[PDB]
Amino acid sequence: FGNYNNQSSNFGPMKGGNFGGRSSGPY
Amino acid sequence: NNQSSNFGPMKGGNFGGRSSGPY
Amino acid sequence: KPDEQGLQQILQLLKESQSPDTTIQRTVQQKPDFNNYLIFVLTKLKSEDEPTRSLSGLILKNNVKFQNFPNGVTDFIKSECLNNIGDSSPLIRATVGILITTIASKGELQNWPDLLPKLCSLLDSEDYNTCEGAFGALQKICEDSAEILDSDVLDRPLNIMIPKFLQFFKHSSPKIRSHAVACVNQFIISRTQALMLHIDSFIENLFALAGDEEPEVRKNVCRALVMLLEVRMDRLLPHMHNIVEYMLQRTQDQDENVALEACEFWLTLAEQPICKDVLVRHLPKLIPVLVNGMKYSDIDIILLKTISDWNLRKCSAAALDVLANVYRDELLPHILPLLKELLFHHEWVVKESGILVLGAIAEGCMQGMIPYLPELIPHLIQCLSDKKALVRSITCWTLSRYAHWVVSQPPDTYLKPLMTELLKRILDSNKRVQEAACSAFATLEEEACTELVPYLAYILDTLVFAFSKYQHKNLLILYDAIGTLADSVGHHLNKPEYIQMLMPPLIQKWNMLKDEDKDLFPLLECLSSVATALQSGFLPYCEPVYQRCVNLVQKTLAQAMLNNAQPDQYEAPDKDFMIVALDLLSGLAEGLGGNIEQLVARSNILTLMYQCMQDKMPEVRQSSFALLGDLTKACFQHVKPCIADFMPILGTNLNPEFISVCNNATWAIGEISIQMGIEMQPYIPMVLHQLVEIINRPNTPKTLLENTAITIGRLGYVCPQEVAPMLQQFIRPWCTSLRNIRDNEEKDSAFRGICTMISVNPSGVIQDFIFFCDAVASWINPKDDLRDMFCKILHGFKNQVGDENWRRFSDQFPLPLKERLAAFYGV
Amino acid sequence: KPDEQGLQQILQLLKESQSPDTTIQRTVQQKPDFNNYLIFVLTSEDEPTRSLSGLILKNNFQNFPNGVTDFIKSECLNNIGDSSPLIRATVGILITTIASKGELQNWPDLLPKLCSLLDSEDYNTCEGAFGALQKICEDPLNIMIPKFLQFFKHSSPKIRSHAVACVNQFIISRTQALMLHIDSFIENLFALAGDEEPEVRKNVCRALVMLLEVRMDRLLPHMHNIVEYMLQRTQDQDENVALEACEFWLTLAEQPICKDVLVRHLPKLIPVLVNGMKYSDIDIILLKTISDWNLRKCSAAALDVLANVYRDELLPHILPLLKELLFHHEWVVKESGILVLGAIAEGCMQGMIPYLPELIPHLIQCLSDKKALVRSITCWTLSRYAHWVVSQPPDTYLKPLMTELLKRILDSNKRVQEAACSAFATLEEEACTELVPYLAYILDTLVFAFSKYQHKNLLILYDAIGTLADSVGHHLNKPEYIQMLMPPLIQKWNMLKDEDKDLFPLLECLSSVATALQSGFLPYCEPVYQRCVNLVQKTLAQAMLNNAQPDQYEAPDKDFMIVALDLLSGLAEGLGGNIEQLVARSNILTLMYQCMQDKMPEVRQSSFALLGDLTKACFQHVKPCIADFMPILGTNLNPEFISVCNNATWAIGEISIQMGIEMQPYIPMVLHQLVEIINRPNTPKTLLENTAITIGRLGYVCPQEVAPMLQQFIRPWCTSLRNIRDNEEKDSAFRGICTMISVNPSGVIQDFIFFCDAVASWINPKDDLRDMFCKILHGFKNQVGDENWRRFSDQFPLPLKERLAAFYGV
């Protein structure tokens, strides 16, 4: 208690992934 | 003045095909 | 002559049609337009033969029928045509003519705006051929054009063009003279102002042409006079009797076209109020003439070796049907003497025409015919067997036109013989007697009902046999007959000996037919009549039948969605599949009752039903609302969750513009009442007001009024505190409705509603208490439970108003009612 | 007799060079399944013709029950060890494919027959069966394991290789028939380590890898001994064995034992990994695409994971090397040093900050190396450090990076484009509002990219534009910007037809963009709206037809719907209120009601999201449907589908706000499950937070209904919201709990210590909220008296005790 791991809120809908995407990367 | 009842749904089933007739 | 001299020989060989050139040259050309018109217009001088020159012009005519007309060389053809509409060789002129007329007809050609302006201008030519060629094309265009022609398409005011047409009534050749009449006729129904102001001229000129030796002018005059009968009655009324006597002669005309166009005059006159008084004196001459036009001759050899949909025979007959409905009994003096000889006269043809007359007379002169029936009916039953096919056919029909009387007599004397004879006729004859007999039998079933039960085995053998015997066309008439039986015999049809023969052919067509075949409509409508009558006997079959119906509804709805999203990419569905599947589902719901619940529970029928009730097409809503009431009554368990959803829609659809939807809505609402009881309360506001409005509405069909009367009653019986408040507003029409209807479990439940509604708001009846008494007096045999309610209310008011006031009031009573209410309820 | 005489002419017309017989024999081919096997098993002619009879036979479902599946099976099992090696293997494929057609049981002798052929004297009979038994294992036989184990010893290379190959397909199954024989396998594997055959050697490696994951207990006694071997195999000649050996380090690094075990080996291991991280064969196939998995990538992946295991301790083992690689030497040796620099990045980030002020400028320089493959990973490695670059003064690192990266997005080859555009999205994401000074500048290039790019990179561009809109928000709402970004997007929109799957990324982009542009999207919003509704309508319609008749109607790609729903949801969030008119005239809400019912979670997830979005925008129109929606909302409060659950939950919260007291009848059908979700163990923090707020919002609007259950949720409710920072939503939930507490104070008594902590989590509550807290805490102090309150708060940690004192005077 007393000390609060401070975090940004995740309130709201969970929007689905976009149908583009980024680079998979070197591996 | 007496009659027979018409209570109920009207089914206008115009897909039965009687003879158009002589005219 | 490189492309031309090669194409000029490809048409010369195309003429000589063997087996080779009839497939080679015909397909060679169909894979150009400019040179063909060069052949028809330029080479069609000495250089080539007329038959050849006009042929290239006619292939061009066929070519025109999209990428051809949108081209820029289309302007060369079009230019070339108008240069020689009056070519001296009739054949080439005729070719140019059909080429022009076709090009223009290709979507009201506004790429050709010079056309009509140049045509009207070419009417004033001196070259007769140029004048007649132009008037020819103008007439065809005026007639084909969907709209009438504005001054914008013409390049002259109609104020100039109408009177210019009338000028050509007055002199030219007979060809032009009628071209002229035809043209002005295109302006009558639209009530074109130019013509209305030139009315007296048009009429005067019409009388001038009446008597013209050329038949085409003459029929146009008749055709014109018929149109004016509907549009401009005020201007003919002075000359009526003089017109009638002209038309009487024209009906008798040497030429069959004129005769038919004149004959249409009576059909049109009959529709008009004045008809009765104006015609009376001419009946002595009109009727003999109509009847005469009702034989055949050339017709005859065609029918035994079909004929036109409409002709002088049908028209005269049709005219005689109407006229009968006009004068009724008053016509019989003019018809009976003539009918007396015909019915027995000659052989074949003259007799047949008399049988036709007798049927035509029916509806109109039914009452005045009753006397003659006991002696005529047996003669007709006797005629059913005549050697000649066409005499059997018409006899079936004429008998069906007296089905109601046959039914009202003792079943042994008229029905039994007729029915026996009719059942025979249904089979073995030619296709024409099958149709007539089968159709006529379906009429008889509808009228006979319970009276058929005796003969049900013989009836059911006949129709089921016909299934194998008949062929597409006659089969649809059979579907109607089997359907009518089921309806007219009800549960009586449910016996294993009947089921085991009726079902197999129906299921055979069921499996044979595919979901896209419009042959399902008559078949399924049949099954909905059957499923209801066979009640729980239908159980072995309901599973697959239900599943299919839902699919049809689902798919139609799906298809309708696609079309809505992408009209230009998805075809609109034929909604008749949906209307028919719904109707069969409702027929399962009625016959099976509670036994349907599972199928409903396990399906998505109610979700689908919900979209159907919102459909644009009245017929679709009408069907679904009937289904709603049927489901409400059979498995409310499953319906109830949706009551909150359906009721607002039910409320919207309480609109008498669509009498059949509004009726079925009303009926569903009342059936929902019974089912919910006091829970109905929240929903009454969105419904009651509209219902009181339609029961009070003048000119409303008996059925709609009756259903509204029962629905209010049921809503009352279930929520008196809700409906009683408005009792004063609807009781007058309420009583008027159910007053004439005989006793029944439904009429019973509506009165029980009114009674609980009174016993809350007794003030509401006072203003019209007279009617509520008449309503109680209509009941021939009340249930003991109802009797008490009526007494407690009637005596209860005697108690309120006082014994003195009660006597003075029950004095203004019609005497029989005073006695009826005095005796039956102790007043 | 006659058809076999034309089969010599059938396999010679499939051997004639002509293109006229390359089409005619293709038409004569598929026009048989018994004759071929005779040509291979019995029938004299050339040897290619006898085996080409096998290819068209193995090509050949109707013959599997047509009596021939006992006549062909006769010929192959009888001649499983033919003269030429070709014919022997062709039979091996045939025995496979005949049994491979499902799990066909026309063969009861099969297994027991081949497992008897194994002890044959004839080599090719033994090898034949073993090659057949292996093909089966890779596509009931567990009793063979101890017999398989025997063949590890004596025979050729081939037979030993099948022996280890078969036993390998049973380690995952964890079968008793092997698990009892553990040590025999392990010991036999060790004796097969020294094997001078690569095919054997990799299987031995692969086995030891699967053993890491299935039987850790048995390897530990050796471990430090197996590592020394694996390290040598990682370095092996023949890249196949090397790669299979590499998977070891990746697998090992996933077991907790790894940390303490490897520490000793690191100085030996790391150089070996890093050495394998460069390329040579694959190198030329890139200038003049390579595989999805090779030694390079595996080594890199291993090195990434180890960096995440050891964190900064990895540095001393690697920095030395990194210096020799990053600057020194040319192309390939350099390239790998920078890949190492990116690989290391996540794990040992903090330890590498000191080194960045010198390295990131150096990387920014490499962004324009004359070698493409050096350009590419430079983009990537840089993106792995985006968070530091953005945390520094913009002019030193961000500005030049954003400059060079933007150049790299355009021109070069397709591979550097990809890396750079994807890297830039990572920058946008970390930079956010720091890029507003450059919006016009950035958008200039990304619009050029839109013309230049091909389909594959186009996808990555869409993401960069989407990410831009999301990272910058309203700052995108300026006519300069909308004037350049919108035309290329409309162009594609108009160019594409409703059936084109390339419509997915476009609409998901246009969804992020529509939110960023608040009201700027108004000129464009009508057709965008209309098309989406069409998509949803058509998708559901087609699904109905398929449902009615699968035989005759193709089921739809519901992604058109998911994409349309997500764009309507972004349109609703953007225009909010302006959407009102469009909604009213459309039939979205009817369609949404079908969507909420759809069997695909994603379709439900998207519509609930839209439901909540439309509840805010134009509740006027959503209200009449509330009675219909709430049962479905109630149904979808199911944690099995986290996303659908969250969105349903979110929508309920949003709904309640819009209807005050009126929400009461709907609480029972929703409440229980919400309380169950919040008490659910191992539940995502997003779902818990949303569940926390919805409970709050509900109880705020209907205290009498929800307070009764205050004891059942107060604890998890507190434990959740307790950790999120101050926001307009946490505030709205806390109000609801306060209102409920002052209706059922009793329900809080039991877990009251958590409410005190939940209150103390606030740092700047609104004044009205500050009071509610105050009045409650005091109410409870008064209730129990000062003495009891002193006893209770003495059990608080210090910061709680002190902040409640200072802030609330309690």
Would you give an account of this structure?
The complex is a heterotetramer, with 2 copies of chain A and 2 copies of chain C. Chain A has 27 residues and is largely without helices or strands. Chain A has no helix or strand. The radius of gyration of chain A is 17 Å and the shape is elongated. Chain C is mainly alpha-helical. Chain C has one domain (1-827): Leucine-rich Repeat Variant (Alpha Horseshoe), CATH 1.25.10.10. Helices cover 71% and strands 0% of the residues of chain C. Classes of the chains: A little secondary structure (27), C mainly alpha (827). At the A-D interface, loops of A face helix 19, helix 26, helix 28, helix 30 and helix 32 of D.
Could you say what the CATH architecture of chain C is? Alpha Horseshoe
Radius of gyration based on Cα positions of chain C:
34 Å
Strand content range of chain C? under 5%
CATH homology group of chain C:
Leucine-rich Repeat Variant
What composes the largest sheet of chain A?
Answer: none
Number of alpha- plus pi-helical segments of chain A: 0
The structure class of chain C reads mainly alpha
* N/C terminus separation of chain A: 42 Å
Under the CATH scheme, which class of chain C? Answer: Mainly Alpha
Radius of gyration of chain A: 17 Å
Query: Which class best fits the helix and strand makeup of chain A?
Result: little secondary structure
Shape of chain C: globular
Q: How many distinct beta strands of chain C?
A: 0
Modified residues (Phosphoserine) (chain A): 23
Protein name (chain A): Heterogeneous nuclear ribonucleoprotein A1
Subcellular location (chain A): Nucleus; Cytoplasm
Modified residues (Omega-N-methylarginine) (chain A): 22
Give keywords.
heterotetramer; A: 27 residues; little secondary structure; 0% helix; C: 827 residues; Leucine-rich Repeat Variant; 50 helices; 0% strand; Transportin-1 (chain D)
